[PDB]
Amino acid sequence: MLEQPYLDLAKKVLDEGHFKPDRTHTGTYSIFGHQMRFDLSKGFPLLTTKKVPFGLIKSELLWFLHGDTNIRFLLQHRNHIWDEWAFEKWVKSDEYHGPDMTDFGHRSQKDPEFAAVYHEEMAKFDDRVLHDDAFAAKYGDLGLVYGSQWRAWHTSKGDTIDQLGDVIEQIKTHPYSRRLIVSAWNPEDVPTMALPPCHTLYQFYVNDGKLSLQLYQRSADIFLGVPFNIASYALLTHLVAHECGLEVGEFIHTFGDAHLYVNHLDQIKEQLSRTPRPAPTLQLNPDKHDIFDFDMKDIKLLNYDPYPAIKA
Amino acid sequence: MLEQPYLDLAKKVLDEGHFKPDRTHTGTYSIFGHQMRFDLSKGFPLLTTKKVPFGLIKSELLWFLHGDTNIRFLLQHRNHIWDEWAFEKWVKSDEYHGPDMTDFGHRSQKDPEFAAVYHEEMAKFDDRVLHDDAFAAKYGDLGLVYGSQWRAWHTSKGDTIDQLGDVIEQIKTHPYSRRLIVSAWNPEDVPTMALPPCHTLYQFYVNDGKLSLQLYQRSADIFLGVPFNIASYALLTHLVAHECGLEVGEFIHTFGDAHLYVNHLDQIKEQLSRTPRPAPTLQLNPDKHDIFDFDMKDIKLLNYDPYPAIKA
Ligand SMILES: CC(=O)c1ccc(N2C(=O)c3cccc(C)c3C2=O)cc1
Numbered sequence: 127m128l129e130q131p132y133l134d135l136a137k138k139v140l141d142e143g144h145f146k147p148d149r150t151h152t153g154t155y156s157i158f159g160h161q162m163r164f165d166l167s168k169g170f171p172l173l174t175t176k177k178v179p180f181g182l183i184k185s186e187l188l189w190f191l192h193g194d195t196n197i198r199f200l201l202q203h204r205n206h207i208w209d210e211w212a213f214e215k216w217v218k219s220d221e222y223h224g225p226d227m228t229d230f231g232h233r234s235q236k237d238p239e240f241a242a243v244y245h246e247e248m249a250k251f252d253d254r255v256l257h258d259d260a261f262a263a264k265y266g267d268l269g270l271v272y273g274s275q276w277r278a279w280h281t282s283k284g285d286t287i288d289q290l291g292d293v294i295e296q297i298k299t300h301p302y303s304r305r306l307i308v309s310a311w312n313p314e315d316v317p318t319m320a321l322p323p324c325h326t327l328y329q330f331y332v333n334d335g336k337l338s339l340q341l342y343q344r345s346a347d348i349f350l351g352v353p354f355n356i357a358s359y360a361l362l363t364h365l366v367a368h369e370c371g372l373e374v375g376e377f378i379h380t381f382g383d384a385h386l387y388v389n390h391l392d393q394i395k396e397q398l399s400r401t402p403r404p405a406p407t408l409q410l411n412p413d414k415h416d417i418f419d420f421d422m423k424d425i426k427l428l429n430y431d432p433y434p435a436i437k438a
Numbered sequence: 439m440l441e442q443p444y445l446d447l448a449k450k451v452l453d454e455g456h457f458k459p460d461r462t463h464t465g466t467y468s469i470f471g472h473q474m475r476f477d478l479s480k481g482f483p484l485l486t487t488k489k490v491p492f493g494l495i496k497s498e499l500l501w502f503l504h505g506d507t508n509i510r511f512l513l514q515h516r517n518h519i520w521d522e523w524a525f526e527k528w529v530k531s532d533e534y535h536g537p538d539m540t541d542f543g544h545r546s547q548k549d550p551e552f553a554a555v556y557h558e559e560m561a562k563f564d565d566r567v568l569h570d571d572a573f574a575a576k577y578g579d580l581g582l583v584y585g586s587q588w589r590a591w592h593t594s595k596g597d598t599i600d601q602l603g604d605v606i607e608q609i610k611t612h613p614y615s616r617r618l619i620v621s622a623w624n625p626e627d628v629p630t631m632a633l634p635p636c637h638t639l640y641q642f643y644v645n646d647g648k649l650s651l652q653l654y655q656r657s658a659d660i661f662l663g664v665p666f667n668i669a670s671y672a673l674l675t676h677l678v679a680h681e682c683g684l685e686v687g688e689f690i691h692t693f694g695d696a697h698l699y700v701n702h703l704d705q706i707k708e709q710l711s712r713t714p715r716p717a718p719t720l721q722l723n724p725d726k727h728d729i730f731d732f733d734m735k736d737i738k739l740l741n742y743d744p745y746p747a748i749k750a
């Protein structure tokens with residue numbers, strides 16, 4: 127079944143993973159160099175063994191695809207997955223006057239009443255970002271995240287390049303190019319930036335009218351992140367194929383360090399109990415073609431029948 | 439045996455490769471997403487099934503490692519593998535006054551007497567680069583090749599960064615970092631530069647005192663280039679491990695497009711006849727540690743017992 131490589135990766139880290147220390151709990155179990163392949167003609171690789179929220183994946187991807195780095199767009203779609211890094215820039219600031227949190231998130235799991243103050247402050251931040259243009263410009267903007275690296279890469283001349291747009295024009299004109307690459311890794315930013323990109327780079331490839339995509343991901347939370355990551359890049363591959371008038375080929379997912387956190391171990395073990403179901407199918411607006419102006423409604427997922435989410 | 443993944447890749451492209459057109463003969467047979475793993479504790483993965491010239495690999499790597507882009511250093515080691523791209527910038531120039539070649543190399547294989555004129559002009563160029571400081575500065579310098587991307591990456595402030603040096607300091611201080619990445623792909627240069635890098639990016643990883651390295655290579659000539667490529671990055675991995683006082687782990691070689699040229703087919707087929715021999719062993723200067731000042735003599739290869747070279 128389509129999603130088995132994901133479950134093999136989880137199991138392989140369980141059986142053959144190497145322990146290492148770090149932060150956010152005791153440490154990790156990891157392997158280096160693993161690869162997962164998904165034949166996108168067999169269905170869409172959204173995990174059936176655990177519910178993965180496709181609406182949050184769709185809206186995050188469309189956000190990148192607009193070259194947008196402001197969480198306001200994501201808030202307008204009820205998508206809060208980028209909030210904390212924005213919240214963090216505001217909390218750590220001089221403009222902020224509420225109950226202090228030197229390290230929320232860590233402390234948010236401990237207290238059942240600091241989690242009360244935090245979730246209110248965060249709710250307030252979310253609202254000011256939604257309705258106050260200047261506050262949003264200042265704190266809603268994450269700066270160097272995927273929308274900018276993909277579509278507005280900052281040059282030495284103080285100019286800006288649309289890598290993804292240029293690659294898509296090349297797919298249409300030079301489909302057999304071996305240079306169809308988008309990188310998110312900028313040696314100039316990477317040593318000071320808040321979040322050096324995990325989704326380091328990707329490459330397209332065309333054969334027999336089918337579009338494939340390989341992602342090199344330097345670092346991967348196998349439990350929390352990888353199931354979202356697989357669905358974002360599979361969707362990316364479908365959308366680019368649609369624009370270019372091609373079929374879909376393979377999505378190949380290649381890792382540097384893929385890891386399980388030492389406290390996510392029983393969660394992934396229970397998921398290994400479950401038996402994949404047949405895969406959903408994706409439907410794209412058949413009469414719209416520029417994916418940089420696609421909206422939520424232009425993307426549909428059919429027949430998705432997941433096991434429950436594992437709140438971990 | 440250590441080199442079997444190389445031979446499996448060759449065979450897989452023979453059996454399951456997809457034809458595509460291009461240039462420099464009729465076209466290619468290719469696959470996308472293949473991976474090769476080499477356990478460097480089992481020996482050094484220089485191919486035994488075809489002689490690969492380790493001196494040219496050593497000197498090219500030391501050249502990158504000095505951050506040098508001038509072919510003069512390579513000429514001083516009798517290494518001509520970068521010559522033609524330098525020669526090309528001089529031939530295409532206004533300063534040049536000899537018998538013209540709008541497209542040598544292509545025409546060099548045809549004629550058995552234009553190949554005579556070319557090899558003389560090239561011999562002259564080589565000599566002027568060796569002995570004329572100003573000519574060398576102007577034409578010996580390839581500009582944006584690996585030595586500059588690895589060790590002198592050009593920033594927006596008109597400054598320069600030593601990616602590889604900084605990564606090596608991080609391996610020593612933060613060995614479990616998942617950010618040990620060197621990239622050679624610069625979205626600003628890549629659309630005009632002469633040679634967008636094939637060796638797109640690489641990443642280190644440490645576990646149990648062993649250093650591994652994964653290379654993402656966007657495009658690969660399986661017959662001509664890959665056997666040199668495997669030995670450069672394996673050697674790179676050994677040298678970095680030596681500096682840092684670690685053992686060697688795995689070298690993982692990951693491809694975008696790996697291809698066979700439609701006219702190299704019988705050459706690779708004959709190589710598939712041959713039976714790997716036990717692998718050579720590498721010896722490094724046991725009392726020297728900064729690899730950025732290693733020289734030819736500090737690296738030794740023991741017990742290398744190859745089948746003959748296949749002049750193709
Ligand atoms: C600093 C760090 O380790 C870290 C960096 C990025 C994320 N991170 C996101 O921003 C993000 C957005 C949307 C989905 C997912 C699954 C993630 C995610 O995992 C999470 C942790």
Ligand SMILES: CC(=O)c1ccc(N2C(=O)c3cccc(C)c3C2=O)cc1
Binds near residue numbers: 663
């Ligand atoms: C333009 C192109 O296709 C092309 C780009 C780079 C190389 N190329 C080199 O510069 C080079 C230097 C040293 C060894 C090898 C095996 C290679 C190589 O294959 C060869 C061809």
Ligand SMILES: O=c1ccn([C@H]2C[C@H](O)[C@@H](COP(=O)(O)O)O2)c(=O)[nH]1
Binds near residue numbers: 324325
């Ligand atoms: O899109 C993402 C972003 C992050 N991660 C996880 C993997 C790592 O646990 C962590 C990255 O932290 P560093 O490796 O950068 O230290 O986030 C993902 O799976 N997908």
Ligand SMILES: O=c1ccn([C@H]2C[C@H](O)[C@@H](COP(=O)(O)O)O2)c(=O)[nH]1
Binds near residue numbers: 305634637657659664
């Ligand atoms: O270090 C190198 C450099 C090049 N190649 C081969 C692979 C491709 O045939 C060609 C690159 O041409 P493009 O893919 O950039 O068009 O060079 C290698 O194997 N190793």
